[PDB]
């Protein structure tokens, strides 16, 4: 073999799926922003 | 092949410096000089294949700063203008390398010297071959760095240390303008390369918003570039360094003080020719500054009584002349005088060093008398060099000084007439102190000591071959280059040097000559010869020593201390800066004033408030 065959493949298996990363970030943003309003309404409750 | 022109001196310097213990004081001397001579041969080949075989060579190695639309690359511009300076730098560098091996045979730290010289050669090759402002800026800063290192060759020497430090600061303050210039021209073109701004450099016509008030854009850029060239050409602004720069070794001074770093500031203008011609305002102030510096140096050199000090002022006068040549859009005489100067002042520097180190290392005019018949070789050499310096009719220096003065006379602008007057009156001064140098030494009764004359040893052969080569050059090069490059529209420059249709006064600088002004600087030269001979050989009973009451000793001090620039500038700028960096910033800003919040400012505050709270 040669260093390209032993390096390119390892790098491209270590990159780990850029599109799925963006998708996961998107639903994480949506889910945590939805939870944010729930937390705000939790704090809005009066003591009595 | 073209990469070998630049990288071989760097490789030789690196290997010599890294393995200066593996190679003796002569191994590095014969190795680095051989590499530099190979580079010189390569430069000659490139000159044959480019200057005559007119086809410029272009290349790009790798992107240096690959940011957004700020493409910086390691490419070089092997252009017709550039290759002439390739010849100029390589030939003189190789000759200086051959010169130094004889001089440095006694100086212990030999290999470090050729290491520094090759570093300088590599840096200035990178500068002249460069095609980007920032990539030219590395050469611009490296020339100053090598200048500092070479003047600082004597770490024990206290004067050399202070001279080197002051030279670095003044050169930094000088090229401040050029450094501002790179990004000044970038904010209008969004690029830094040369070929993409010389294509369209006349289109912008807007203004800017500077610190105080709105001014022009192109004119401001050219002004900044000229201020940058001031630091590396010892102009009126900052020329405190060159007169005090000859505190180091001699062979380098033939290369740094009068041959090549001389060419940096003028080559700044020469390379960016289609930028200054579209900024007429900058050209006029450039002409004023050049004429003022030339006259100032020419009248400066006459009083001084040292070999190296006076010729430094001659170099500064030639700097002023060349800056004016670059200030009237007549860049042809600028580069022609550059090529001549690199011959007939490097030759004089080698001759001065030869007569200095062969006479028990003494450089003086008051003490050393006459020993011309003791050795005719290097005196014949220096006589030829001086004859070129005055520009005796039908010599190498005449073909430059005559044409540059005629060009000064022809242009009727408010700066052309004033600067022509200043150059005409400076010809008398230069022909006076050149012959003063020729007379106070070698043509007077010997006033030296009786021990040094006995210990006399002529110039060794290896150091005399560079002198022979320079003498052969600066007697035929003027005649050979008069027609081929200043010949009313010679077709070898191509895009290297561009002259606008409007400000092109060359044909009427020769066919409209009144013949009462063209041959007048020879008249001032012969008058200076007469007065110098009379004062310094026969009529010296009262014309030499003036023991009057007042206004005559102070006249002596005014020009000896060079207009008190080293006094007024020091005390009023750097002494004040050093005073107020300790008694202002360290007193009423950080330490003492706002330190009322640190130790002893609030610590004692809580030694009373907290105490009276338990009770």
């Amino acid at each position: 073999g040669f260093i390209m065959e032993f390096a390119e493949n390892l790098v491209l298996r270590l990159m780990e799926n850029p599109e799925e990363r963006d998708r996961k970030a998107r639903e994480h943003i949506y889910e945590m922003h939805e939870r944010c309003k729930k937390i705000k309404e939790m704090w809005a409750l009066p003591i009595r | 092949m073209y990469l070998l022109i630049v990288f071989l001196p760097l490789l030789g310097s690196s290997v010599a410096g890294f393995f200066g213990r593996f190679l003796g004081s002569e191994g590095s001397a014969i190795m680095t000089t051989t590499c530099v001579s190979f580079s010189s041969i390569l430069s000659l080949i490139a000159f044959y294949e480019v200057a005559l075989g007119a086809s410029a060579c272009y290349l790009r190695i790798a992107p240096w700063i690959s940011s957004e639309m700020f493409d910086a690359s390691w490419g070089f511009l092997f252009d017709s203008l550039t290759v002439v300076m390739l010849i100029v730098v390589t030939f003189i560098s190789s000759l200086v390398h051959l010169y130094s091996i004889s001089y440095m045979s006694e100086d212990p730290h030999s290999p470090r010297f050729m290491c520094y010289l090759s570093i300088f050669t590599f840096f200035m090759l990178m500068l002249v071959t460069g095609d980007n402002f920032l990539q030219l800026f590395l050469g611009w800063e490296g020339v100053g760095l090598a200048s500092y290192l070479l003047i600082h060759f004597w770490f024990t020497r206290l004067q050399a240390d202070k001279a080197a430090i002051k030279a670095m600061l003044v050169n930094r303050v000088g090229d401040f303008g050029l450094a501002l210039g790179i990004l000044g021209c970038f904010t209008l073109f969004q690029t830094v390369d040369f070929s993409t701004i010389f294509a369209c450099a006349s289109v912008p016509r807007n203004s800017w918003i500077f610190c105080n008030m709105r001014l022009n854009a192109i004119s401001l850029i050219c002004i900044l570039l000229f201020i940058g060239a001031v630091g590396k050409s010892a102009q009126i602004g900052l020329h405190t360094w060159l007169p005090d720069a000859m505190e180091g070794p001699t062979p380098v001074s033939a290369l740094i003080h009068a041959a090549t770093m001389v060419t940096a500031g003028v080559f700044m203008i020469a390379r960016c020719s289609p930028l200054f011609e579209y900024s007429p305002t900058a050209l006029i102030v450039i002409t004023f500054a050049g004429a003022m510096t030339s006259f100032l140096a020419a009248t400066t050199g006459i009083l001084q009584n040292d070999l190296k000090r006076v010729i430094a002022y001659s170099t500064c006068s030639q700097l002023g002349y060349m800056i004016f040549a670059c200030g009237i859009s007549n860049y042809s005489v600028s580069v022609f005088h550059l090529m001549n100067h690199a011959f007939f002042k490097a030759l004089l520097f080698l001759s001065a060093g030869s007569v200095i180190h062969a006479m028990s290392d003494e450089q003086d005019m008051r003490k050393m008398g006459g020993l011309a018949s003791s050795f005719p070789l290097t005196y014949a050499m220096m006589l030829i060099g001086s004859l070129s310096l005055i520009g005796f009719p039908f010599l190498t220096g005449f073909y430059s000084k005559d044409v540059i003065l005629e060009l000064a006379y022809t242009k009727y602008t408010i700066s052309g007439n004033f600067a022509f007057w200043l150059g005409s009156v400076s010809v008398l001064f230069t022909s006076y102190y050149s012959f003063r140098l020729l007379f106070l030494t070698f043509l007077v009764p010997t006033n030296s000591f009786g021990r040094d004359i006995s210990r006399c040893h002529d110039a060794p052969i290896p150091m005399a071959i560079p002198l022979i080569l320079l003498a052969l050059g600066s007697l035929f090069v003027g005649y050979l280059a008069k027609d081929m490059m200043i010949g009313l529209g010679t077709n070898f420059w191509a895009n290297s040097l561009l002259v606008l249709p409007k400000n092109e006064i060359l044909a009427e600088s020769e066919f409209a000559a009144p013949t009462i002004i063209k041959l007048i600087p020879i008249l001032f030269s012969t008058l200076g010869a007469f007065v110098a001979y009379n004062v310094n050989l026969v009529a010296d009973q009262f014309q030499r020593a003036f023991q009057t009451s007042t206004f005559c000793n102070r006249l002596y001090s005014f020009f000896n201390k060079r207009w008190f620039f080293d006094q007024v500038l020091n005390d009023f700028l750097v002494r004040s800066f050093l005073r107020f960096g300790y008694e202002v910033s360290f007193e009423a800003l950080d330490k003492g004033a706002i330190e009322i919040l640190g130790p002893y400012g609030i610590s004692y505050t809580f030694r009373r408030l907290a105490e009276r709270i338990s009770q």
């Binding site: - | 918003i209 008694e583 202002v584 007193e587 009423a588 800003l589 003492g592 004033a593 009322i596």
Partner: protein, 69 residues
């Protein structure tokens, strides 16, 4: 002659560890007030005014109204 450390001269020790603590000297004096009022409140104000003036002049050339800042 086997000490790698410096001799620590007495006359140099005071010079060294005297400028390190200048709070006692720089407390209340006439020249201090002038220096502070001319180089810590004066110059910063002048340069700030220069910068905002430059921004205003840049805005005017483009034509957009100047921001309050």
């Amino acid at each position: 002659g086997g000490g790698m450390e410096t001799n620590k001269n007495k006359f140099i020790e005071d010079w060294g560890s005297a400028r390190e603590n200048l709070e006692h000297n720089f407390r209340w004096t006439r020249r201090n007030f002038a220096l502070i009022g001319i180089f810590g409140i004066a110059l910063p104000i002048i340069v700030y005014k220069g910068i905002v003036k430059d921004f205003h002049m840049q805005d005017e050339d483009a034509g957009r109204p100047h921001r309050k800042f």
